[PDB]
A = this chain, B = another copy of it.
Amino acid sequence: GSEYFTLQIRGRERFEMLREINEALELKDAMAG
């Protein structure tokens, strides 16, 4: 299975941007299986 990694992000706005991207990529993951 996938290994998980943690990224340190500077700034709330940047965090929210990268979090939204990550959440979207994970939704794509869910449709693949």
Contacts and interface: CB of A to CB of B under 8 A. Distances in A.
Q: What is the interface of chain A mostly: helix, strand, loop, or mixed?
A: helix
Identical chains bound together, number:
4
Contacts of A17: 17
Most buried by B among A9, A12, A15, A17: A9
Nearest to A12: B3
Nearest to A30: B31
A3 B10 CA distance: 6
B10 A29 contact: yes
Contact of A8 (B5, B12, B14): B5
Contacts of A15: 5, 7
Interface of A: 2-12, 14-15, 17-29, 31
